[PDB]
Design a protein around this motif. Structure first.
Motif, mmCIF file in Angstrom:
data_model
loop_
_atom_site.group_PDB
_atom_site.id
_atom_site.type_symbol
_atom_site.label_atom_id
_atom_site.label_comp_id
_atom_site.label_asym_id
_atom_site.label_seq_id
_atom_site.Cartn_x
_atom_site.Cartn_y
_atom_site.Cartn_z
ATOM 1 N N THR A 30 0.814 -1.202 0.000
ATOM 2 C CA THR A 30 0.000 0.000 0.000
ATOM 3 C C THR A 30 0.860 1.270 0.000
ATOM 4 O OG1 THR A 30 -1.809 -1.226 0.992
ATOM 5 C CG2 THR A 30 -1.894 1.226 1.094
ATOM 6 N N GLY A 31 2.009 1.259 0.669
ATOM 7 C CA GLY A 31 2.885 2.435 0.668
ATOM 8 C C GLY A 31 3.404 2.737 -0.729
ATOM 9 N N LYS A 32 3.684 1.694 -1.492
ATOM 10 C CA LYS A 32 4.136 1.840 -2.890
ATOM 11 C C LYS A 32 3.014 2.363 -3.791
ATOM 12 C CE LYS A 32 7.839 -1.648 -3.188
ATOM 13 N NZ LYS A 32 8.085 -3.057 -3.635
ATOM 14 N N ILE A 33 1.772 1.897 -3.578
ATOM 15 C CA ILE A 33 0.593 2.468 -4.254
ATOM 16 C C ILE A 33 0.484 3.952 -3.941
ATOM 17 C CG2 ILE A 33 -1.964 2.491 -4.235
ATOM 18 C CD1 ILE A 33 -0.883 0.235 -5.834
ATOM 19 N N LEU A 34 0.598 4.297 -2.666
ATOM 20 C CA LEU A 34 0.450 5.678 -2.258
ATOM 21 C C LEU A 34 1.556 6.527 -2.902
ATOM 22 C CD1 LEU A 34 -0.639 5.124 1.423
ATOM 23 C CD2 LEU A 34 -1.903 6.444 -0.294
ATOM 24 N N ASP A 35 2.750 5.967 -3.004
ATOM 25 C CA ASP A 35 3.865 6.706 -3.659
ATOM 26 C C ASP A 35 3.509 7.036 -5.131
ATOM 27 O OD1 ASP A 35 5.427 6.579 -1.320
ATOM 28 O OD2 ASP A 35 6.605 4.867 -2.017
ATOM 29 N N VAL A 36 2.980 6.048 -5.853
ATOM 30 C CA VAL A 36 2.537 6.253 -7.226
ATOM 31 C C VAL A 36 1.454 7.343 -7.295
ATOM 32 C CG1 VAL A 36 1.396 5.267 -9.215
ATOM 33 C CG2 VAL A 36 3.171 3.938 -8.046
ATOM 34 N N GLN A 51 -2.614 -0.684 10.935
ATOM 35 C CA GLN A 51 -1.878 0.102 9.929
ATOM 36 C C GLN A 51 -2.117 1.609 10.082
ATOM 37 O OE1 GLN A 51 0.343 -1.530 8.121
ATOM 38 N NE2 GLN A 51 -0.379 -3.650 8.439
ATOM 39 N N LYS A 52 -1.988 2.126 11.312
ATOM 40 C CA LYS A 52 -2.277 3.535 11.550
ATOM 41 C C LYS A 52 -1.425 4.461 10.685
ATOM 42 C CE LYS A 52 -3.032 4.981 15.976
ATOM 43 N NZ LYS A 52 -4.407 4.508 16.267
ATOM 44 N N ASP A 53 -0.171 4.109 10.445
ATOM 45 C CA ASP A 53 0.695 4.991 9.676
ATOM 46 C C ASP A 53 0.261 5.142 8.215
ATOM 47 O OD1 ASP A 53 2.185 5.631 11.917
ATOM 48 O OD2 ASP A 53 3.717 4.089 11.504
ATOM 49 N N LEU A 54 -0.160 4.040 7.591
ATOM 50 C CA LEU A 54 -0.694 4.090 6.224
ATOM 51 C C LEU A 54 -2.001 4.895 6.184
ATOM 52 C CD1 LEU A 54 0.198 0.530 4.924
ATOM 53 C CD2 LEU A 54 1.052 2.724 3.995
ATOM 54 N N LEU A 55 -2.857 4.722 7.196
ATOM 55 C CA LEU A 55 -4.073 5.487 7.297
ATOM 56 C C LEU A 55 -3.806 7.001 7.311
ATOM 57 C CD1 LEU A 55 -7.137 4.501 7.683
ATOM 58 C CD2 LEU A 55 -6.656 4.891 10.108
ATOM 59 N N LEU A 56 -2.799 7.420 8.093
ATOM 60 C CA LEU A 56 -2.423 8.799 8.145
ATOM 61 C C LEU A 56 -1.866 9.301 6.811
ATOM 62 C CD1 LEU A 56 -1.154 8.804 11.784
ATOM 63 C CD2 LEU A 56 -3.118 10.013 10.840
ATOM 64 N N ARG A 57 -1.146 8.464 6.079
ATOM 65 C CA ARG A 57 -0.722 8.831 4.706
ATOM 66 C C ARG A 57 -1.929 9.071 3.818
ATOM 67 N NH1 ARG A 57 3.649 5.751 1.415
ATOM 68 N NH2 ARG A 57 3.304 7.686 0.264
ATOM 69 N N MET A 58 -2.953 8.236 3.952
ATOM 70 C CA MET A 58 -4.127 8.417 3.122
ATOM 71 C C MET A 58 -4.743 9.809 3.311
ATOM 72 S SD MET A 58 -5.786 4.657 3.686
ATOM 73 C CE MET A 58 -4.900 3.134 3.295
ATOM 74 N N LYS A 59 -4.896 10.225 4.564
ATOM 75 C CA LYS A 59 -5.495 11.524 4.862
ATOM 76 C C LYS A 59 -4.548 12.663 4.484
ATOM 77 C CE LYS A 59 -6.055 15.065 8.110
ATOM 78 N NZ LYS A 59 -6.478 16.150 7.181
ATOM 79 N N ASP A 60 -3.285 12.508 4.826
ATOM 80 C CA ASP A 60 -2.276 13.559 4.634
ATOM 81 C C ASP A 60 -1.972 13.810 3.175
ATOM 82 O OD1 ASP A 60 -2.182 13.795 7.406
ATOM 83 O OD2 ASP A 60 -0.303 12.681 7.633
ATOM 84 N N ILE A 102 -1.582 -6.031 -4.057
ATOM 85 C CA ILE A 102 -1.372 -7.397 -3.568
ATOM 86 C C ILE A 102 0.047 -7.875 -3.822
ATOM 87 C CG2 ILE A 102 -1.890 -9.841 -4.089
ATOM 88 C CD1 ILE A 102 -4.946 -8.656 -4.304
ATOM 89 N N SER A 103 0.658 -7.431 -4.911
ATOM 90 C CA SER A 103 2.004 -7.893 -5.227
ATOM 91 C C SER A 103 2.954 -6.778 -5.562
ATOM 92 C CB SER A 103 1.961 -8.881 -6.383
ATOM 93 O OG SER A 103 1.541 -8.248 -7.571
ATOM 94 N N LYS A 104 4.229 -7.148 -5.661
ATOM 95 C CA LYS A 104 5.312 -6.210 -5.938
ATOM 96 C C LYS A 104 5.131 -5.471 -7.260
ATOM 97 C CE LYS A 104 9.446 -5.079 -7.968
ATOM 98 N NZ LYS A 104 10.571 -4.161 -7.575
ATOM 99 N N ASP A 105 4.468 -6.095 -8.239
ATOM 100 C CA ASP A 105 4.275 -5.500 -9.578
ATOM 101 C C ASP A 105 3.036 -4.602 -9.716
ATOM 102 O OD1 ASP A 105 6.552 -6.684 -10.693
ATOM 103 O OD2 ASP A 105 5.433 -8.327 -11.631
ATOM 104 N N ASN A 106 2.146 -4.617 -8.731
ATOM 105 C CA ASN A 106 0.912 -3.834 -8.824
ATOM 106 C C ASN A 106 1.145 -2.343 -8.900
ATOM 107 O OD1 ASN A 106 -1.457 -5.788 -6.777
ATOM 108 N ND2 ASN A 106 -0.534 -6.186 -8.790
ATOM 109 N N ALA A 107 2.145 -1.861 -8.182
ATOM 110 C CA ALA A 107 2.468 -0.431 -8.176
ATOM 111 C C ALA A 107 2.880 0.032 -9.581
ATOM 112 C CB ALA A 107 3.557 -0.136 -7.143
ATOM 113 N N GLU A 108 3.636 -0.825 -10.280
ATOM 114 C CA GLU A 108 4.101 -0.558 -11.643
ATOM 115 C C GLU A 108 2.918 -0.555 -12.604
ATOM 116 O OE1 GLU A 108 7.247 -3.362 -12.582
ATOM 117 O OE2 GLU A 108 8.627 -1.752 -13.158
#
Ligand SMILES: C[As](C)(=O)[O-]
Ligand SMILES: [Zn+2]
Ligand SMILES: [Zn+2]
Ligand SMILES: [Zn+2]
Ligand SMILES: [Zn+2]
Length: 207
Positions: A50-56, A76-85, A175-181
């Motif tokens: 999810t962090g890689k998705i958010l980076d994209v 996953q509080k930290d990812l949740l905060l990325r979503m809002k931020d 779900i996988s390493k290639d999804n972000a790409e």
């Protein structure tokens, strides 16, 4: 008027589903005369990407709604905060991810309210307007109860998990390493075809 409790599984959408959604605060598409489309994700499990998705999404400046469960919020509080931020909308995917048609009314209200309150307290998002039912399972009753509590019932028009049209609501995955790409390529490709990526708030305003 006893609401029907017969369960349906969302898929695409036919007259029955169309009018069930129409009368009970649901949608699965935006305006089909504009090339606006809507990216969404469901987050009941964290696969580690999810962090890689958010980076994209940040790189490409593309908004999304993430429909989160209680397990996800707690773990996953930290990812949740990325979503809002980072400019996304956090949606409600229920506390424990039961089939809504299988629970009593008191339990359904707790399943929605607990997530809404947790999203607001944890992240400071002002409003939680959007609900997506676990597994896309619904009845007339569950749609109507969800609307009565002040939520839209948000389904989808295209889902892709590795085993487009105007107004599409996409349900994609992390779900996988290639999804972000794949996501980065899809965003680029769709923009070259004149599509614009918008938020569920934009959808509602698109009227
Ligand atoms: C519609 As689902 C499999 O993300 O709960
Ligand atoms: Zn547009
Ligand atoms: Zn848990
Ligand atoms: Zn789910
Ligand atoms: Zn899925």
């Amino acid at each position: 008027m006893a609401y029907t409790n017969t369960p349906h599984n969302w898929g695409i959408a036919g007259k029955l589903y169309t009018d069930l959604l129409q009368k009970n605060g649901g949608f699965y598409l935006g305006d089909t005369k504009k090339k606006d489309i809507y990216l969404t994700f469901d987050n009941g499990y964290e696969n580690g990407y999810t962090g890689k998705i958010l980076d994209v999404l940040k790189e490409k400046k593309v908004p999304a709604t993430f429909f989160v469960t209680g397990h996800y919020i707690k773990t996953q509080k930290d990812l949740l905060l990325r979503m809002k931020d980072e400019g996304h909308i956090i949606g409600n995917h229920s506390w424990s991810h039961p089939d809504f048609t299988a629970v009593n009314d008191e339990k359904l209200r707790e399943e929605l309210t607990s997530v809404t309150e947790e999203i607001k307290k944890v992240t400071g998002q002002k409003e939680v307007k959007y609900v997506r039912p676990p597994r896309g399972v619904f009845s007339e009753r569950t749609l109507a109860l969800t609307k009565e509590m002040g939520y839209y019932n948000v389904f989808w028009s295209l889902a892709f998990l590795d085993w487009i049209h105007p107004g599409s609501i996409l349900l994609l995955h992390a779900i996988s390493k290639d999804n972000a790409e794949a996501l980065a390529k899809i965003i680029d490709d769709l923009r070259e075809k004149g599509y614009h990526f918008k938020s569920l708030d934009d959808l509602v305003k698109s009227n």
